[PDB]
DNA sequence: ACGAATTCG
DNA sequence: ACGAATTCG
């Protein structure tokens, strides 16, 4: 059976046009009706909005104050079994690792998200956090399918410094042949929200998975959130990623 | 005076004398020159010299010939004791990507019956410019290796280096030694820039670094004898000659 | 949440 | 000529 999710850093720390941009995020979610949504940079009033607007999803959060991650699980498609939060002891930005154990498509999943330490200056801590994520991905039983989707803030060289992805962990964008149309998820030439008067682009938002051979097969990957809202800005400074996969029992 | 017994020795001071701080500069220059008068080094390597400072050196260090790394702005200089050092030529090597007018100054001399290439630089400043500083260090080390095998090469200057940056470079080449390391990393002269002990910059924090370093290319032919700090006395104005301490080094040239 | 510049302690 | 924090482009 086919499943879909979106992962999206929705820039709740930008207070400008935030109500309109939150409505814009959810209009995108309504269009694609994903089974799972992974969000980063949620803030408390944004979470309160989602609890009403997305009342058809079970909402799991990474914290209750500041800014944090969330995982939304479509009721009637996804059975919620537990949540786990793993700290990043040396974060300076309240980052952590949020996991949920669920049933979806007839199989058990561990679904994970994080907003890894931001900016070039904090590369070393970001690498330590990536190692924590990768270590946690190895802990689930082999019959459980593990998906991480989140804002990694990664540069390719940092993954190399980490040792590269393990032999049994795959990046969905790489798996699909490194398609150019959805490569960059943060692009200051195409996205004006931060008003950065220069052109930089990065593949900060990434999807990793661990599954028994042939039991999880990515089928599509697309950017979402590409349309300006009435205020002339985008829902976020990031594009979202929409991924569909076949879950084979 | 430098008699027969010490004819095998080269002594020198290297010092970033902070000519970019105009406040109290004439008095601070007199403080530097008082140090030069006390130790009478054969050679002085200076960084952050400015044109007015050259005039102060001509007045209060008149026994030294001045070779400069540029004519305007701020620049390095090598001072040669008249009657001891024979000047043979001056070479300047550019750092094409510097944003701070930095370069490599080489002065070829004869002293004590030996040929020397004496080099100084003020490598790119601040943690943010690490990449360019490492590129400049590679230029310096390459030039040290290129000199004729008969010549004795000494670099002394303000490197702005952090230890981790020399490791990123791959370490000093096999025939190039750091004088402080050679002498066993003595604690008394380890830090040459120290905002707890020196308040010239008025930084309200305590940080210390070994920015000022001496490299030499040598087998057993060049033996460091001593390394000591200078410039640790406050002057009449209540400030030091510079935000850096200077380094006083003696080396023996051996058969 | 970019790199470069600047301020503050 | 420090590092952190903030601001500029
Ligand atoms: Mg952000
Ligand atoms: Mg297909
Ligand atoms: Mg200086």
Short mmCIF file of C-alpha atoms (C1' of nucleotides) and ligand atoms in Angstrom, two decimals:
data_model
loop_
_atom_site.label_atom_id
_atom_site.label_comp_id
_atom_site.label_asym_id
_atom_site.label_seq_id
_atom_site.Cartn_x
_atom_site.Cartn_y
_atom_site.Cartn_z
CA UNK A 1 0.00 0.00 0.00
CA UNK A 2 1.12 3.58 -0.58
CA UNK A 3 1.83 6.07 2.21
CA UNK A 4 2.77 9.72 2.13
CA UNK A 5 4.36 12.18 4.51
CA UNK A 6 5.52 15.78 4.54
CA UNK A 7 8.47 17.12 6.51
CA UNK A 8 8.67 20.90 6.83
CA UNK A 9 10.45 23.49 8.94
CA UNK A 10 7.63 26.04 9.07
CA UNK A 11 9.63 28.95 10.59
CA UNK A 12 7.45 29.65 13.61
CA UNK A 13 10.26 31.91 14.85
CA UNK A 14 9.33 34.41 12.11
CA UNK A 15 6.53 36.40 13.71
CA UNK A 16 5.78 38.36 10.54
CA UNK A 17 2.60 37.21 8.77
CA UNK A 18 2.63 34.14 10.99
CA UNK A 19 -1.16 33.58 11.15
CA UNK A 20 -1.46 33.79 7.36
CA UNK A 21 1.61 31.58 6.86
CA UNK A 22 0.26 28.93 9.25
CA UNK A 23 -3.01 28.89 7.31
CA UNK A 24 -0.87 28.59 4.17
CA UNK A 25 0.98 25.57 5.55
CA UNK A 26 -2.30 23.86 6.38
CA UNK A 27 -3.79 24.61 2.96
CA UNK A 28 -0.82 22.71 1.52
CA UNK A 29 -1.41 19.87 3.99
CA UNK A 30 -5.09 19.75 2.97
CA UNK A 31 -4.12 19.41 -0.69
CA UNK A 32 -1.93 16.34 -0.15
CA UNK A 33 -3.67 14.78 2.92
CA UNK A 34 -0.48 13.03 4.07
CA UNK A 35 -0.51 10.11 6.49
CA UNK A 36 2.23 11.74 8.60
CA UNK A 37 3.53 15.29 8.95
CA UNK A 38 6.91 16.08 10.53
CA UNK A 39 7.23 19.73 11.57
CA UNK A 40 10.06 21.84 12.94
CA UNK A 41 10.06 25.31 14.54
CA UNK A 42 6.55 24.98 15.94
CA UNK A 43 5.78 27.49 18.72
CA UNK A 44 3.00 27.19 21.35
CA UNK A 45 0.32 29.29 19.58
CA UNK A 46 1.10 27.50 16.32
CA UNK A 47 0.67 24.17 18.09
CA UNK A 48 -2.64 25.38 19.53
CA UNK A 49 -3.76 26.30 16.00
CA UNK A 50 -2.77 22.86 14.71
CA UNK A 51 -4.69 21.10 17.49
CA UNK A 52 -7.87 22.68 16.09
CA UNK A 53 -7.11 22.84 12.35
CA UNK A 54 -5.55 19.34 12.29
CA UNK A 55 -7.91 17.76 14.82
CA UNK A 56 -8.12 14.81 12.40
CA UNK A 57 -4.47 14.05 13.29
CA UNK A 58 -2.93 12.88 16.54
CA UNK A 59 -0.36 15.54 17.47
CA UNK A 60 2.86 14.62 19.30
CA UNK A 61 5.22 17.43 20.34
CA UNK A 62 8.91 17.67 21.19
CA UNK A 63 8.47 20.32 23.89
CA UNK A 64 5.87 22.66 25.34
CA UNK A 65 7.77 25.99 25.39
CA UNK A 66 10.11 27.88 23.09
CA UNK A 67 10.16 26.27 19.68
CA UNK A 68 10.02 22.57 18.99
CA UNK A 69 9.19 19.73 16.63
CA UNK A 70 5.92 17.89 16.13
CA UNK A 71 4.69 14.72 14.46
CA UNK A 72 1.10 14.58 13.18
CA UNK A 73 -0.49 11.15 12.61
CA UNK A 74 -3.62 10.79 10.48
CA UNK A 75 -6.38 9.20 12.56
CA UNK A 76 -7.81 6.07 10.97
CA UNK A 77 -4.63 5.46 8.95
CA UNK A 78 -1.97 5.54 11.68
CA UNK A 79 -2.27 3.81 15.05
CA UNK A 80 -0.29 5.65 17.73
CA UNK A 81 1.48 3.27 20.16
CA UNK A 82 4.05 5.43 22.02
CA UNK A 83 6.29 8.48 21.90
CA UNK A 84 9.93 8.78 22.94
CA UNK A 85 12.02 11.92 23.38
CA UNK A 86 15.81 11.62 23.43
CA UNK A 87 17.85 14.64 24.59
CA UNK A 88 20.81 16.23 22.90
CA UNK A 89 22.76 16.99 26.10
CA UNK A 90 25.02 19.65 24.54
CA UNK A 91 22.49 21.56 22.43
CA UNK A 92 22.47 25.33 22.82
CA UNK A 93 19.16 25.59 20.93
CA UNK A 94 16.85 23.20 22.84
CA UNK A 95 17.08 20.60 20.07
CA UNK A 96 16.17 16.94 20.65
CA UNK A 97 15.07 13.74 18.93
CA UNK A 98 11.36 12.95 18.83
CA UNK A 99 10.24 9.41 18.00
CA UNK A 100 6.82 7.80 17.68
CA UNK A 101 6.06 4.11 17.42
CA UNK A 102 3.05 3.45 15.19
CA UNK A 103 1.27 0.95 12.96
CA UNK A 104 0.80 2.11 9.37
CA UNK A 105 0.09 0.14 6.20
CA UNK A 106 0.05 -3.11 8.18
CA UNK A 107 3.61 -2.71 9.46
CA UNK A 108 5.28 -1.34 12.56
CA UNK A 109 7.19 1.93 12.16
CA UNK A 110 9.46 4.10 14.25
CA UNK A 111 9.02 7.63 12.88
CA UNK A 112 11.60 10.21 13.98
CA UNK A 113 12.20 13.93 13.55
CA UNK A 114 14.67 16.53 14.73
CA UNK A 115 15.84 20.06 14.01
CA UNK A 116 19.59 19.60 14.24
CA UNK A 117 21.76 22.41 15.60
CA UNK A 118 21.75 25.36 13.19
CA UNK A 119 24.46 27.42 11.40
CA UNK A 120 27.98 26.78 10.14
CA UNK A 121 29.50 27.72 13.52
CA UNK A 122 27.84 24.74 15.25
CA UNK A 123 28.99 22.02 12.83
CA UNK A 124 30.65 19.94 15.56
CA UNK A 125 27.51 19.74 17.71
CA UNK A 126 25.38 19.07 14.62
CA UNK A 127 27.60 16.08 13.78
CA UNK A 128 27.28 14.73 17.33
CA UNK A 129 23.51 14.99 17.03
CA UNK A 130 23.53 13.21 13.67
CA UNK A 131 25.45 10.36 15.32
CA UNK A 132 22.75 10.19 18.01
CA UNK A 133 20.06 10.00 15.33
CA UNK A 134 21.87 7.28 13.39
CA UNK A 135 22.51 5.28 16.55
CA UNK A 136 18.83 5.40 17.49
CA UNK A 137 17.87 4.24 13.99
CA UNK A 138 19.82 1.03 14.62
CA UNK A 139 17.98 0.16 17.84
CA UNK A 140 14.60 -0.88 16.43
CA UNK A 141 13.89 -4.55 15.65
CA UNK A 142 14.72 -5.54 12.09
CA UNK A 143 11.01 -6.05 11.32
CA UNK A 144 10.26 -2.42 12.30
CA UNK A 145 10.66 0.16 9.56
CA UNK A 146 12.50 3.31 10.68
CA UNK A 147 11.99 6.68 8.98
CA UNK A 148 13.75 9.87 10.02
CA UNK A 149 12.56 13.07 8.34
CA UNK A 150 13.59 16.50 9.54
CA UNK A 151 15.70 19.63 9.23
CA UNK A 152 19.28 18.40 9.55
CA UNK A 153 21.07 21.65 8.63
CA UNK A 154 23.65 19.31 7.09
CA UNK A 155 26.40 19.99 4.60
CA UNK A 156 27.54 16.98 2.57
CA UNK A 157 31.04 17.19 4.06
CA UNK A 158 29.59 16.83 7.57
CA UNK A 159 28.03 13.48 6.66
CA UNK A 160 31.45 12.35 5.41
CA UNK A 161 33.05 13.49 8.67
CA UNK A 162 30.40 11.42 10.46
CA UNK A 163 31.56 8.32 8.57
CA UNK A 164 28.82 8.44 5.95
CA UNK A 165 25.43 6.84 6.27
CA UNK A 166 25.64 3.25 7.56
CA UNK A 167 25.27 0.44 5.03
CA UNK A 168 21.66 -0.18 6.13
CA UNK A 169 20.51 3.48 6.23
CA UNK A 170 19.44 5.23 3.03
CA UNK A 171 18.71 8.83 2.07
CA UNK A 172 15.45 8.94 0.10
CA UNK A 173 16.66 11.69 -2.27
CA UNK A 174 19.80 9.68 -3.05
CA UNK A 175 17.72 6.49 -3.43
CA UNK A 176 15.55 8.19 -6.07
CA UNK A 177 18.60 9.16 -8.14
CA UNK A 178 19.36 12.64 -6.77
CA UNK A 179 16.59 14.40 -8.74
CA UNK A 180 17.44 18.04 -9.40
CA UNK A 181 13.90 19.41 -9.07
CA UNK A 182 13.72 18.76 -5.30
CA UNK A 183 17.40 18.92 -4.37
CA UNK A 184 17.52 22.24 -2.50
CA UNK A 185 15.09 22.76 0.37
CA UNK A 186 16.42 26.16 1.51
CA UNK A 187 17.13 28.61 -1.30
CA UNK A 188 17.52 32.37 -0.80
CA UNK A 189 17.37 33.10 -4.53
CA UNK A 190 13.92 31.51 -4.90
CA UNK A 191 12.65 32.29 -1.38
CA UNK A 192 12.57 35.89 -0.06
CA UNK A 193 11.25 35.27 3.45
CA UNK A 194 14.54 36.01 5.26
CA UNK A 195 15.30 39.02 3.01
CA UNK A 196 18.86 37.75 2.55
CA UNK A 197 20.25 39.85 -0.38
CA UNK A 198 22.40 37.03 -1.77
CA UNK A 199 21.94 33.56 -3.29
CA UNK A 200 22.65 30.48 -1.15
CA UNK A 201 21.00 27.07 -1.36
CA UNK A 202 21.25 23.91 0.72
CA UNK A 203 19.69 20.48 1.10
CA UNK A 204 19.04 20.97 4.80
CA UNK A 205 15.85 18.90 4.97
CA UNK A 206 16.55 15.17 4.58
CA UNK A 207 14.88 11.77 4.87
CA UNK A 208 16.71 8.67 6.12
CA UNK A 209 15.25 5.19 6.34
CA UNK A 210 16.12 1.71 7.56
CA UNK A 211 14.02 -1.22 6.34
CA UNK A 212 14.40 -4.89 5.55
CA UNK A 213 15.32 -5.26 1.88
CA UNK A 214 12.42 -4.27 -0.37
CA UNK A 215 9.99 -3.56 2.47
CA UNK A 216 10.11 0.23 2.04
CA UNK A 217 10.49 1.66 -1.45
CA UNK A 218 10.46 5.44 -2.05
CA UNK A 219 8.28 6.27 -5.04
CA UNK A 220 8.23 10.07 -5.24
CA UNK A 221 9.76 13.16 -3.70
CA UNK A 222 8.55 16.71 -4.37
CA UNK A 223 8.95 20.18 -2.91
CA UNK A 224 5.85 21.83 -1.43
CA UNK A 225 5.12 25.33 -0.17
CA UNK A 226 6.33 26.91 -3.42
CA UNK A 227 3.52 29.47 -3.85
CA UNK A 228 3.47 32.97 -2.45
CA UNK A 229 0.61 33.85 -0.13
CA UNK A 230 -1.54 36.99 -0.28
CA UNK A 231 1.11 38.89 1.71
CA UNK A 232 3.70 38.17 -0.99
CA UNK A 233 5.79 35.82 1.15
CA UNK A 234 5.99 32.05 1.38
CA UNK A 235 4.69 29.82 4.20
CA UNK A 236 8.29 29.35 5.35
CA UNK A 237 11.90 30.11 4.48
CA UNK A 238 12.17 26.35 3.83
CA UNK A 239 10.42 24.33 1.21
CA UNK A 240 8.65 21.26 2.51
CA UNK A 241 9.30 17.72 1.24
CA UNK A 242 6.44 15.45 0.19
CA UNK A 243 7.44 11.79 -0.03
CA UNK A 244 5.42 8.75 -1.06
CA UNK A 245 6.62 5.22 -0.41
CA UNK A 246 5.38 1.69 -0.88
CA UNK A 247 5.21 -0.36 2.30
CA UNK A 248 5.62 -4.00 1.29
CA UNK A 249 4.79 -6.71 3.81
CA UNK B 1 79.28 44.34 23.97
CA UNK B 2 79.37 41.36 21.58
CA UNK B 3 82.85 39.91 22.05
CA UNK B 4 84.79 36.97 20.66
CA UNK B 5 83.03 34.36 22.81
CA UNK B 6 79.59 35.31 21.43
CA UNK B 7 80.72 35.47 17.78
CA UNK B 8 78.85 32.20 17.10
CA UNK B 9 75.51 33.57 18.32
CA UNK B 10 72.65 35.41 16.65
CA UNK B 11 70.30 37.24 19.00
CA UNK B 12 67.02 38.76 17.96
CA UNK B 13 63.70 40.13 19.13
CA UNK B 14 60.37 39.66 17.34
CA UNK B 15 57.53 41.95 18.36
CA UNK B 16 54.17 43.13 17.05
CA UNK B 17 54.38 46.67 18.39
CA UNK B 18 50.75 47.69 17.67
CA UNK B 19 51.36 50.76 15.52
CA UNK B 20 47.64 50.69 14.70
CA UNK B 21 47.04 52.02 18.23
CA UNK B 22 47.89 55.69 17.88
CA UNK B 23 47.31 56.41 21.55
CA UNK B 24 50.58 57.07 23.42
CA UNK B 25 52.49 55.80 20.38
CA UNK B 26 55.67 57.94 20.74
CA UNK B 27 56.09 56.94 24.39
CA UNK B 28 55.41 53.28 23.55
CA UNK B 29 57.99 53.43 20.74
CA UNK B 30 60.49 54.79 23.26
CA UNK B 31 59.66 51.79 25.44
CA UNK B 32 60.39 49.39 22.58
CA UNK B 33 63.65 51.20 21.85
CA UNK B 34 64.65 51.01 25.54
CA UNK B 35 64.31 47.24 25.28
CA UNK B 36 66.45 47.16 22.13
CA UNK B 37 69.09 49.24 23.92
CA UNK B 38 69.13 46.87 26.91
CA UNK B 39 69.66 43.64 24.93
CA UNK B 40 71.37 45.01 21.77
CA UNK B 41 69.99 42.24 19.50
CA UNK B 42 71.63 41.62 16.13
CA UNK B 43 68.23 41.63 14.40
CA UNK B 44 64.73 42.90 15.23
CA UNK B 45 61.59 41.60 13.51
CA UNK B 46 58.66 44.02 13.87
CA UNK B 47 54.99 43.89 12.89
CA UNK B 48 52.35 46.68 12.70
CA UNK B 49 54.94 49.35 11.95
CA UNK B 50 53.55 52.59 10.47
CA UNK B 51 55.49 55.42 8.78
CA UNK B 52 55.66 57.64 11.90
CA UNK B 53 57.04 54.68 13.86
CA UNK B 54 59.93 54.43 11.41
CA UNK B 55 60.90 57.99 12.35
CA UNK B 56 60.78 57.06 16.05
CA UNK B 57 63.09 54.10 15.33
CA UNK B 58 65.48 56.30 13.36
CA UNK B 59 65.70 58.63 16.38
CA UNK B 60 65.88 56.11 19.25
CA UNK B 61 67.29 53.00 17.53
CA UNK B 62 69.69 54.75 15.16
CA UNK B 63 72.21 51.88 15.16
CA UNK B 64 69.73 49.72 13.19
CA UNK B 65 69.18 49.72 9.44
CA UNK B 66 65.43 49.51 8.72
CA UNK B 67 64.02 47.31 5.93
CA UNK B 68 60.25 47.59 5.54
CA UNK B 69 57.53 45.41 4.05
CA UNK B 70 55.57 48.31 2.55
CA UNK B 71 55.58 52.11 2.35
CA UNK B 72 52.06 53.08 3.51
CA UNK B 73 49.45 51.75 5.89
CA UNK B 74 50.89 49.26 8.35
CA UNK B 75 53.62 46.77 7.60
CA UNK B 76 56.45 44.64 8.90
CA UNK B 77 60.09 45.61 9.26
CA UNK B 78 63.44 43.92 9.83
CA UNK B 79 66.09 45.93 11.69
CA UNK B 80 69.79 45.08 11.25
CA UNK B 81 72.48 46.13 13.72
CA UNK B 82 75.01 48.28 11.89
CA UNK B 83 78.53 46.88 12.03
CA UNK B 84 77.36 43.33 12.80
CA UNK B 85 75.03 42.45 9.93
CA UNK B 86 75.91 42.84 6.25
CA UNK B 87 72.79 43.51 4.17
CA UNK B 88 72.76 41.59 0.87
CA UNK B 89 69.20 41.87 -0.48
CA UNK B 90 65.50 42.31 0.34
CA UNK B 91 62.75 40.04 -1.05
CA UNK B 92 59.00 40.59 -0.70
CA UNK B 93 56.58 37.76 -1.49
CA UNK B 94 52.90 38.72 -1.85
CA UNK B 95 49.93 37.00 -0.25
CA UNK B 96 47.56 37.42 -3.22
CA UNK B 97 44.37 36.80 -1.22
CA UNK B 98 45.10 38.88 1.89
CA UNK B 99 42.42 41.34 2.95
CA UNK B 100 44.81 43.03 5.40
CA UNK B 101 47.82 43.95 3.17
CA UNK B 102 49.89 41.11 4.66
CA UNK B 103 52.98 39.71 2.93
CA UNK B 104 56.28 37.90 3.51
CA UNK B 105 59.45 39.96 3.98
CA UNK B 106 62.83 38.25 3.54
CA UNK B 107 66.20 39.92 4.14
CA UNK B 108 69.35 38.10 3.05
CA UNK B 109 72.37 38.94 5.19
CA UNK B 110 75.77 37.79 6.38
CA UNK B 111 76.35 37.73 10.13
CA UNK B 112 79.14 36.16 12.14
CA UNK B 113 80.55 34.55 9.01
CA UNK B 114 77.31 32.82 7.96
CA UNK B 115 74.64 33.53 5.34
CA UNK B 116 71.07 33.93 6.60
CA UNK B 117 67.62 34.40 5.14
CA UNK B 118 65.70 36.33 7.82
CA UNK B 119 61.93 36.28 7.32
CA UNK B 120 58.95 37.93 8.98
CA UNK B 121 55.23 38.20 8.43
CA UNK B 122 52.05 39.26 10.19
CA UNK B 123 49.66 36.49 9.16
CA UNK B 124 45.97 37.21 8.60
CA UNK B 125 44.28 38.10 11.90
CA UNK B 126 41.26 36.73 13.84
CA UNK B 127 39.60 33.32 14.14
CA UNK B 128 37.29 34.14 11.21
CA UNK B 129 40.23 34.31 8.76
CA UNK B 130 41.68 30.89 9.69
CA UNK B 131 41.54 29.55 6.12
CA UNK B 132 43.58 32.41 4.65
CA UNK B 133 46.00 32.32 7.60
CA UNK B 134 46.67 28.62 6.94
CA UNK B 135 47.26 29.36 3.24
CA UNK B 136 49.76 32.06 4.20
CA UNK B 137 51.54 29.71 6.62
CA UNK B 138 51.95 27.23 3.76
CA UNK B 139 53.51 30.01 1.67
CA UNK B 140 55.94 30.81 4.49
CA UNK B 141 56.94 27.19 5.02
CA UNK B 142 57.40 26.64 1.29
CA UNK B 143 59.72 29.63 1.08
CA UNK B 144 61.74 28.34 4.04
CA UNK B 145 62.20 25.03 2.24
CA UNK B 146 63.14 26.71 -1.08
CA UNK B 147 66.15 28.63 0.25
CA UNK B 148 69.60 27.38 -0.82
CA UNK B 149 70.79 24.51 1.33
CA UNK B 150 73.83 26.50 2.50
CA UNK B 151 71.75 29.40 3.85
CA UNK B 152 70.36 29.42 7.39
CA UNK B 153 66.66 30.33 7.44
CA UNK B 154 64.97 31.97 10.42
CA UNK B 155 61.33 33.08 10.45
CA UNK B 156 60.10 35.17 13.36
CA UNK B 157 56.78 36.92 13.35
CA UNK B 158 53.17 37.27 14.41
CA UNK B 159 51.50 34.13 13.07
CA UNK B 160 48.08 34.52 14.75
CA UNK B 161 48.11 30.71 14.91
CA UNK B 162 46.04 28.38 17.02
CA UNK B 163 47.62 24.98 17.63
CA UNK B 164 44.74 23.22 15.87
CA UNK B 165 45.50 25.24 12.73
CA UNK B 166 49.06 23.97 12.49
CA UNK B 167 47.63 20.44 12.72
CA UNK B 168 45.20 21.23 9.88
CA UNK B 169 48.30 22.28 7.94
CA UNK B 170 49.82 18.84 8.55
CA UNK B 171 52.38 20.05 11.09
CA UNK B 172 55.73 21.71 10.53
CA UNK B 173 57.85 20.03 7.81
CA UNK B 174 60.55 17.61 8.90
CA UNK B 175 63.48 20.06 8.74
CA UNK B 176 61.61 23.06 10.22
CA UNK B 177 61.48 23.55 13.98
CA UNK B 178 59.68 25.89 16.36
CA UNK B 179 62.15 27.43 18.83
CA UNK B 180 59.72 27.28 21.77
CA UNK B 181 59.02 23.60 21.06
CA UNK B 182 62.74 22.88 20.66
CA UNK B 183 63.43 24.33 24.12
CA UNK B 184 60.82 22.02 25.67
CA UNK B 185 57.73 24.27 25.68
CA UNK B 186 58.80 26.43 28.65
CA UNK B 187 55.83 27.91 30.52
CA UNK B 188 57.41 31.31 31.19
CA UNK B 189 57.25 32.46 27.55
CA UNK B 190 54.38 30.34 26.22
CA UNK B 191 51.77 33.08 25.79
CA UNK B 192 52.70 36.21 23.82
CA UNK B 193 49.23 37.83 23.82
CA UNK B 194 47.34 37.80 27.12
CA UNK B 195 44.38 40.05 27.93
CA UNK B 196 44.44 39.19 31.64
CA UNK B 197 48.01 40.47 32.02
CA UNK B 198 47.88 43.15 29.28
CA UNK B 199 45.11 45.76 29.16
CA UNK B 200 46.20 47.81 26.14
CA UNK B 201 43.15 46.73 24.11
CA UNK B 202 40.82 47.15 27.12
CA UNK B 203 39.25 43.73 26.49
CA UNK B 204 37.23 42.94 29.68
CA UNK B 205 37.96 39.22 29.49
CA UNK B 206 40.86 36.80 29.95
CA UNK B 207 42.19 35.13 26.78
CA UNK B 208 45.76 34.15 25.97
CA UNK B 209 47.51 32.81 22.87
CA UNK B 210 50.93 31.92 21.48
CA UNK B 211 50.53 34.09 18.39
CA UNK B 212 54.19 35.11 18.03
CA UNK B 213 56.42 32.25 16.88
CA UNK B 214 59.94 31.48 15.65
CA UNK B 215 60.62 28.83 12.99
CA UNK B 216 64.05 27.79 11.77
CA UNK B 217 65.37 25.41 9.14
CA UNK B 218 68.31 23.31 10.32
CA UNK B 219 71.26 19.07 11.15
CA UNK B 220 72.47 20.40 14.48
CA UNK B 221 73.70 23.49 12.65
CA UNK B 222 71.28 25.87 14.44
CA UNK B 223 70.70 25.40 18.18
CA UNK B 224 68.33 27.65 20.16
CA UNK B 225 69.92 28.69 23.44
CA UNK B 226 67.21 30.75 25.15
CA UNK B 227 63.77 32.25 24.71
CA UNK B 228 62.31 34.97 26.96
CA UNK B 229 59.51 37.53 26.89
CA UNK B 230 60.11 41.27 26.77
CA UNK B 231 57.85 44.29 27.09
CA UNK B 232 56.11 43.33 30.34
CA UNK B 233 56.75 46.67 32.13
CA UNK B 234 54.09 49.37 32.18
CA UNK B 235 55.32 52.72 30.88
CA UNK B 236 54.77 56.18 32.38
CA UNK B 237 51.32 56.39 30.76
CA UNK B 238 50.20 53.23 32.57
CA UNK B 239 50.11 51.07 29.44
CA UNK B 240 52.48 48.56 27.85
CA UNK B 241 54.56 49.11 24.70
CA UNK B 242 52.12 46.86 22.85
CA UNK B 243 49.17 44.51 23.29
CA UNK B 244 51.70 41.75 22.51
CA UNK B 245 54.74 40.69 24.45
CA UNK B 246 57.95 40.49 22.46
CA UNK B 247 60.22 37.45 22.20
CA UNK B 248 63.97 37.57 22.83
CA UNK B 249 65.82 34.59 21.35
CA UNK B 250 69.45 33.55 21.07
CA UNK B 251 70.63 30.82 18.70
CA UNK B 252 74.05 29.28 18.19
CA UNK B 253 75.37 28.52 14.71
CA UNK B 254 77.35 25.29 14.98
CA UNK B 255 79.83 23.47 12.71
"C1'" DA C 1 19.23 30.91 8.91
"C1'" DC C 2 23.87 32.88 4.27
"C1'" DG C 3 28.66 35.38 5.03
"C1'" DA C 4 30.60 39.66 6.50
"C1'" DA C 5 30.76 43.44 9.58
"C1'" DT C 6 30.15 45.49 13.88
"C1'" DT C 7 29.20 46.02 18.94
"C1'" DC C 8 29.56 44.52 23.68
"C1'" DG C 9 31.53 42.65 27.64
"C1'" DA D 1 42.79 41.57 18.25
"C1'" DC D 2 39.15 37.50 22.55
"C1'" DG D 3 34.17 35.27 21.94
"C1'" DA D 4 29.37 36.17 22.07
"C1'" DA D 5 25.74 38.61 20.48
"C1'" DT D 6 23.72 41.54 17.20
"C1'" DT D 7 23.23 43.77 12.89
"C1'" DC D 8 24.20 44.56 7.90
"C1'" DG D 9 24.10 43.30 3.02
MG1 LIG E 1 14.83 28.51 10.74
MG1 LIG E 2 8.09 4.66 -9.39
MG1 LIG E 3 47.33 43.89 16.46
#
